Amino acid sequence: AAQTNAPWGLARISSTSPGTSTYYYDESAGQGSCVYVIDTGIEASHPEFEGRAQMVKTYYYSSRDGNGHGTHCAGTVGSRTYGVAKKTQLFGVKVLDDNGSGQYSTIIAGMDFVASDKNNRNCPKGVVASLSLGGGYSSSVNSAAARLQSSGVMVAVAAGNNNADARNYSPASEPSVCTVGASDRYDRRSSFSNYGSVLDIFGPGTDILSTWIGGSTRSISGTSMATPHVAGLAAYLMTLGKTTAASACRYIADTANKGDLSNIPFGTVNLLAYNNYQA
């Protein structure tokens, strides 16, 4: 399949080179996989989700995304026009309030919820969790992310936007999950992106067009935007049978575009998520 006039990040993940505008992908499109978006919620009624999105848990009075961040991230995972895995099932878990903030205790509870809730769901091709969030180092937060991964979910987490080593941030610093840095359309490390040996992969994160609340769209930047590209890619590859939840991060690194990024500090991987799709 081919989507013309695609957002640059989608084109980027199906090309060896930057600057293209067509996203080439296998038509299976993540059908049969599920991705939990652990964030400010998802506006499930947005037409771009085609009914494939639902809220399953909130930690605040409302399940509504009153911010937009979670809706944007979900759209990069699986919306029709802006998503990597256009057929995946999206589950919203609202651990962040409408200002984008959340306590570590709530975030931990939300991860434990996903580990159990996946047993209530039909996800024959596997389960992914996308965590576009984080703060300072916490052993407890890292442990919760490790439990979620151990339970059989492919966990992808944002590296953080501090232009610093991600070893000091959580869940970015947890070794057993997939920690995602951000790049721009010219294959430079995004100026805000964290780095360090704990990073596993980079994904597009500067000027990412996706869904927004009120049935709208907008372009924003962050490692929060790179993370759902990697989560959607994992769901797509699991549907194709090319990897499993336990090995998807390593497989994505195995098959990444290598050495293409600029301004990568010594000690940080130079690897950009790539679907290697061949029509």
Known binding residue 18? Answer is no
* DSSP conformation class of 183: E
Instruction: State the Cα–Cα distance between residues 265 and 41, nearest whole angstrom.
Output: 34
Domains of the chain with bracketed CATH = 2-272 (3.40.50.200)
Question: Residues 135, 173: contact at Cβ < 8 Å?
Answer: no
Distance CA 278, CA 125 (A): 21
Please give the DSSP secondary-structure letter assigned to residue 119: G
Q: Any residues with CB less than 8 A from the CB of 209 and at least 6 apart, and which?
A: 7, 82, 217, 218, 219
Question: Are 115 and 129 contacting, i.e. CB atoms less than 8 angstroms apart?
Answer: no
Pairing of strands 126-131, 33-39: parallel
d(CA 251, CA 260): 18
Strands 154-158 and 126-131, sheet pairing? parallel
Pick the closest to residue 194 from 225, 178, 172 (CA basis): 172
247 burial (CB, 10 Å; 0-12 / 13-18 / 19+) is: middle
Does the annotation place 260 within a ligand binding site?
Answer: yes
List active site positions.
Answer: 39, 69, 224
Amino acid letter at 114?
Answer: V
97 annotated to bind ligand: no
Bridge partners of residue 210, in order along the sequence: 218
26 is in an annotated binding site: no
Determination technique used: X-ray
Distance between CA atoms of residues 32 and 112, nearest Å: 22
The strand pairing partners of 2, in sequence order, are 24
Query: Which CA distances in Å does 113 have to 40, 58, 88, 235, 243?
Result: 15, 10, 20, 20, 24
Can you tell me the distance from the alpha carbon of 188 to that of 262, in angstroms, rounded to the nearest whole number? 5
List the resolution, Å. Answer: 1.4
Residue that has been written with the tokens 């903030």 in this structure: 101
Q: Binding site annotation covers 40?
A: no
Q: How far apart are CA 145 and CA 175, in angstroms?
A: 10
Which string of b and e fits 22-58 if b means at least 16 CB within 10 Å?
A: ebbbbebbbbbbbbbbbbbbbbbebebbeebbebbbb
